[PDB]
Design a protein around this ligand. Sequence first.
Ligand code: SF4
Ligand code: SF4
Ligand code: SF4
Ligand code: SF4
Ligand code: SF4
Ligand code: SF4
Ligand code: SF4
Ligand code: FES
Ligand SMILES: [Ca+2]
Lengths: 166, 145, 147, 565, 905
Amino acid sequence: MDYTLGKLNDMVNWGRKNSIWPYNFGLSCCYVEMVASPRQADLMVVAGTCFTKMAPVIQRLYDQMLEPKWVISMGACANSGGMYDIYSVVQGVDKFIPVDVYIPGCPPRPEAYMQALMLLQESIGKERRPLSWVDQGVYRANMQSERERKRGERIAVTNLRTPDEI
Amino acid sequence: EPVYLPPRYRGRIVLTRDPDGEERCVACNLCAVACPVGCISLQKAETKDGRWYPEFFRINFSRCIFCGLCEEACPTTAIQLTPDFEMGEYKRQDLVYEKEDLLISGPGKYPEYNFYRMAGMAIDGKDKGEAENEAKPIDVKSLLP
Amino acid sequence: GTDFLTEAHLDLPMEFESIGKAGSRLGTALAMAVDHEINMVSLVRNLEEFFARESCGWCTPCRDGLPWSVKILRALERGEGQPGDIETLEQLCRFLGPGKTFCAHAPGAVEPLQSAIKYFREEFEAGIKQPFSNTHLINGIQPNLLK
Amino acid sequence: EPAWQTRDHLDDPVIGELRNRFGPDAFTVQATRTGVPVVWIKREQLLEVGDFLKKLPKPYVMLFDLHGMDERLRTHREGLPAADFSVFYHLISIDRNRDIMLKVALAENDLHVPTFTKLFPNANWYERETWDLFGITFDGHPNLRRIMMPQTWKGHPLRKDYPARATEFSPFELTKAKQDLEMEALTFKPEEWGMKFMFLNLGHGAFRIVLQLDGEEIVDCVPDIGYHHRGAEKMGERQSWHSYIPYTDRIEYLGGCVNEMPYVLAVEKLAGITVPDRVNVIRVMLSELFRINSHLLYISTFIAFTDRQKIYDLVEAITGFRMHPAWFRIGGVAHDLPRGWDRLLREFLDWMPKRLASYEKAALQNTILKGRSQGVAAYGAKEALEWGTTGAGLRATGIDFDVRKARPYSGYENFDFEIPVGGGVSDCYTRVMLKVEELRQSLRILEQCLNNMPEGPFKADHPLTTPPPKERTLQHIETLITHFLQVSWGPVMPANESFQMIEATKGINSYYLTSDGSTMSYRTRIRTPSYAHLQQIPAAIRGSLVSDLIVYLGSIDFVMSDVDR
Amino acid sequence: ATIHVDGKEYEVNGADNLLEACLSLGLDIPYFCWHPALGSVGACRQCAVKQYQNAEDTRGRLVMSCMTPASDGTFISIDDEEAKQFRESVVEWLMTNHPHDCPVCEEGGNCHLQDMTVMTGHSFRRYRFTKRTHRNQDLGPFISHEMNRCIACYRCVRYYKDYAGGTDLGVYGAHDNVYFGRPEDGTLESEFSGNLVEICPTGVFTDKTHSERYNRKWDMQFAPSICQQCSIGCNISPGERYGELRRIENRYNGTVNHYFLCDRGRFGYGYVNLKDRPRQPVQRRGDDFITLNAEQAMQGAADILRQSKKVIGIGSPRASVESNFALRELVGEENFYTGIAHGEQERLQLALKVLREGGIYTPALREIESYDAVLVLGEDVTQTGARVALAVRQAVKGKAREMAAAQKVADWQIAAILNIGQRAKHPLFVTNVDDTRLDDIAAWTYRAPVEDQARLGFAIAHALDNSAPAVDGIEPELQSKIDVIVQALAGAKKPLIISGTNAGSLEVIQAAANVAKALKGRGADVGITMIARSVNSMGLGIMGGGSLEEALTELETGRADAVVVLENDLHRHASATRVNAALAKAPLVMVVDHQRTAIMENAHLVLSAASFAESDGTVINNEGRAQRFFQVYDPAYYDSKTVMLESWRWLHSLHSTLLSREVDWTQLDHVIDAVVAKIPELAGIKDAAPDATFRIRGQKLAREPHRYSGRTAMRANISVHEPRQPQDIDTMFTFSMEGNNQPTAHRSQVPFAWAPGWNSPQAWNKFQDEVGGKLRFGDPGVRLFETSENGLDYFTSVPARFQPQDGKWRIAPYYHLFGSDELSQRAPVFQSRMPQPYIKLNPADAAKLGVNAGTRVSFSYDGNTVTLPVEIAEGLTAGQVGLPMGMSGIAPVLAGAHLEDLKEA
Ligand code: SF4
Ligand code: SF4
Ligand code: SF4
Ligand code: SF4
Ligand code: SF4
Ligand code: SF4
Ligand code: SF4
Ligand code: FES
Ligand SMILES: [Ca+2]
């Protein structure tokens, strides 16, 4: 598939996806729902509202993280700013750091976070990276989007339970 | 293991269909204005029989807080929040769900309601006087006093 | 367009003021007698169908409130009356009096309904036989059960 | 004469006392729906009025609130003094069980008021926030600097001419702020933070506190807050009365419906709505469920994820959401209770007594926790009153002040429950004891809710009930019209001011709403208890260790989203 | 007068009724059947209040506030319990038959019935029976009909018949089966039928053109603008959504066009949404059309202009004052040309000289309704200045108003006034080449050629004053009718003389000026009105410049090699062959325009100018009133590649890049200051609107309502990241909801009317000092010139009688409301409404030429043989041929021209 700028390459991809050490940065009320130094971490889970005062803190702790680095945004706040289109809130954490996996919700479920972990492992295993730095270009796969992959089963839904039950 | 969800669970938003099979949405734009985030955008189009429908219907799910105010404001029970939470994506542009990503094949949580059985506006299959609690139209040229 | 009077009012003189204090009008002074075989609900229904179909349509209370009283009286005729119907009729008689409508057609329309409810109320109460309902049950929506 | 009626409160004895002391032509009484005597005082008489109120036979001992209002866009100012801006001071007399709202009018060219910090020490942060968001200067304030916005911020966000929406993101400002934060310790000025030894910067919520240490002893400390500022009040001026409800949910996120309750009660006061009994019982039941959830989290964090999971399952069954239901409505609740709710509540109330006994055993009789928690950084009733402390700390000082009993709301007077109070000392162990007893009383209230639940409507029979019942909206044209205009343009609240104070999970939470006759709030003021609880920290740990500060931070119940709003 | 409402004391006008007095005080009384312009009739019974006899009265009596005078010492109660229950019951009675239609109704969110249902507090339905239904009618392309939603408030019939004078709308049927509509299916014939969509308080009559691309009122982006479709200058509120113009709403101006537009202005906005519009600068090279951005287009044009020896500019009356002035600065005053023909320019300057040097006051459009006699000379006002015709109808009904006022009848009791004044009306005398739409109320109609109409005017002036020049050869029948006109005009307190440049004759304007001067010399309060052609015709006349013929001569000889044409198609004002030859000879043609025109094929450079929806500027009224129009939306907000700048921005940047080789775009206030500095006659356009620094307590004026939706979704299909809000440095408005639109805000420019509880066009009540009066802080727009102290002399050039010559046919102009205007006839909804181009023949001329009705005849004009079908015109004088001006192929410059070789095809 398309890439945006060999057996042992599969081995390192498998090892990277099968052992991810996250650094959960909980800004706000996504943090209670989702519940290691950044030098020893490789995944940054940004959960919560990205305030203008705490945006340098997020940027600094992302800069302290070592390559390879992946970012999972939890909730509408980290995705886009959410409901807080306001003077003191940065409209999405992707305004200043790159994000690998987005999760909608306010707050999302922990199982939504686990599904995004599956998505991150798939994206890690389907990527090609420079093996040794002695081509030094990161190639990320242009994966098929989840909404078109799951479109058939979603549209095929006909009847749901009435809201008068618990 | 699968996770149980109650029938009222505020998850993935869908657009539903009437029991006759037509889409329930009349493109009345009440859900878009009732959205506190403003993440619904749609445009009204009209068929040849006069039936209102959305020409497009898009929801920015990267902005949506799943509060259910759009379902509360819908006068046709078209837009509904369903028990589904697996909606993660790779790109934020892919969280913009168009009308083909939302329109399911059935009535959803409300199995029998049809707005166009209530409205006096005439469409195909329902002329004037055939809606609920409606009398037949009486011409002003009628001989009866 | 005049109020009904009973047998006790048969002894007063046919004057404007004497019938005025009795709760009616002298009118054209051409009286009409109603015997025991006549259902008062049916008679008032016929009167109100006349008055509703002779409205000129200019003003809201007559034009859109006389047919409501006609439909209520038809329901009472068929034994399909519901609670609140007689209260709705009394509200219609109160809100179609002089000054409320553009002309005097609707006060004359509501005079016999007023007098018949005042005197022969038992037939109007006998017309009510089913509970009040104007809402269908929508599946998936719990109703707001008012008390 | 309903509870939402407009009153001037001229029969309040404080009005006659003020008239006797200062004269009949010294103040203006305003008729509101706040339930509070609202008195407009001249600026030059504010300090003597406050000192007179502080020395009454049953004195006004607590400054409940202090903030500002931009009156330049307000069109319905009939019966009000000429003001471009105003500053309001909400004061509470606990012994009198009364309260008063003083208001000072200010011209736009002269935006300065005498400081209230000499009378009430907790006025410091309130005056700092008023200066930050309105640009109102307070003469004699020790360190009048910004507390929500950074020190380099331009303008005052709560002014009516300040744009509410997010500005264009600039990486240059981000790099400048990051470089300022990197060299913050290198160019640290002790006088700029209100101080006069080593300086420590370090981070319930991520907030920075700057500490002055004599080797290891805490000598002075000033916290840097506003890192969680969401502009919820400015958003209150940007959302309709109905569409603001999820924003009320996200104030104190462990409270949920507890946070929704004062806002919907204040809007119902503006609307003139008296809700039926079933609405009161439903709201009380959800509030007590969320209070149990918050108290369980607080107790477990002081010492777990199963009883909270059962609470969240019941809340998700009722409202469709776990932590942010947004289920309360103007005039009622969003839906009726689902069939099968009573069996879920019955299974919850049978699982709970033995778990509550287990929490009592693990918390109260824990000898090491009792030794660690007793007597460390404690305060009495005088320190609680002068700092605006409410909730478990205030009742641990011995002052029996619960909103559900002193000023009953939402039908709480129809339930049988006790208000636990401590001795004269408010430390960690007494607050934990009080929260455990409040857990037991909330379980009692839930049992009473389950035993005799009223049958009736879940929405009021008022035209301003937003939204109308759904079945009549789908069936009836006038109900459809009311729904159409209520969800799109918004419900029209006639111009008034309302106030609702409730007992939240962490203290007293209040909404002060000003309607200018429109479908949007002219002014939404949220008083949160965690702000006042965080302000009193430097007065309670002065002379202690850093570990004592950590234990005190874990002992007070606060969240930074509640602090910064 | 003193009234006591709910215990409070108020000072009101005794001549007003209680409803309008209480609405002017800010009190809220629900109402349907009353309208400020239509009067009171007491139909809907919604405005009920409780009136007491005195202060010590507790019972009271329910009365209609619209039918009750606000007399001195009047005690009423609005918030009385019984009155509240009665108003709620009236709403409920209306709701019994109302269809469940709000989601699929175009009135939703803009509906007076919705607002009044909410205002009375009625939300519970206890009616359980059936609802009456109605079949709908086809009412033409503009108005959609939905008879189910009617509440029988009679507003439509009262407006259409009593106010607008229309004949094909009415009320039919009986008691609860009242039907409002036409007797049969067909297009509504009135030129002012479009005002029904705001007159009707429900969704019975809706804007069909808006219904095609419907969106709700809260989703609209509004701006206060001026209608561009003729010279009358009606204030409008264009409302857009998703980058396209979607509706034209009437914007209240108590001095000009208060509640009402004409159908041309309301429905001829569709040219803005044409897909063939230029959106980028395009340069031709060989046969390749390369697209440039703004900077390199400016640089290339500047170097190419700098290499030329003489640059000339051709303005247009379509363009604003700022754009024409920027062109005049770019090319120089000596090289600037107006772009209209020589005769059109001469008539325009004569009308202007009569306006600001004739010593006779020119009334505003609202002020026309107070004149007691009207003489219209040569101007078919219904097809050229339609709102003037509506105001003339009101002035004609002034006589019935006078006889009712003599009988102590209040001015709002319209039924009594109309009953007293049965058919008595103020004198109206219209002259035209044929029958006009004003002939139903005209005291006399004169069908004659324009020289004969001018001779009639000069004879009227001579009979009014013997110092005026006489006319020789007047027949005794025409002399008797002239004497009738003179007796009517001399006995009038306020005579009004209306003329214009559309007749194509200078002598008609001279005769109208002489009639006005003769009436002024007798001490009468005479007013004069001149109807120009286009939106900024008077501004182009005030600015001046050479004619289009001089510019074409300069291009054809070769003294000028560069021509810059601003917003001008050049074929309406000159022959097509001459324009094509001159533009093909010119090595550099630059066209700054917003519409695809035929001269863009020969254009070296095309600059995509903005239309009125996407530009700011000032336009000058037919009465000399400078009026500012504001940009509605940013065209680059959705399509980022769109480079669609203001015309004055393009030309100022071009002049800056020509002079200093660098780009400075401009600000609008800088151009306005330049206009008032270099041109002292246009110094009043500074005061037309406040500058961009104007604030309402520090905040800007909002362009969209506060509940504007989809802010994070409307552009989400292009990019999920929300773009920057567009910045407006030109004006005081912001392109967002973060602004002020309070009805009490101290301003004159109102983008849209909205108040809490008033979502309909009845929200304009809150923005006025008194209802039906002026805006609260004054109407926008100032007069450029006052009345001169001294007038003109009598024009002694009396034209000779019309003589038909063999082989030559004098072209009589036949203007149409739908078609004669250029931009409006480009709109797609006007194609169905406009008719096929016919050529009008006298029966005698058609019998001589052997052609019946409907037969195609071919004629040669300027060496071009075109064929048109023949329509027989009885009223047209023989020796004349009738042609529709403004259509494709028939320029308005053809009016008054001759015509050779009329042969059957
Ligand atoms: S997305 Fe929702 S739950 Fe998460 S931090 Fe934002 S407001 Fe809180
Ligand atoms: S659930 Fe709430 S945030 Fe999401 S689209 Fe609906 S109204 Fe908007
Ligand atoms: S509220 Fe319902 S019917 Fe109306 S536009 Fe939205 S989904 Fe469609
Ligand atoms: S009361 Fe009179 S005016 Fe009114 S509709 Fe009836 S008949 Fe006509
Ligand atoms: S006319 Fe008004 S009340 Fe009637 S259906 Fe349309 S929006 Fe609703
Ligand atoms: S069609 Fe409209 S304006 Fe005419 S009577 Fe009916 S509601 Fe009134
Ligand atoms: S009269 Fe002229 S300016 Fe007024 S709306 Fe019609 S075309 Fe526009
Ligand atoms: S507005 Fe007065 S009766 Fe209609
Ligand atoms: Ca502009």
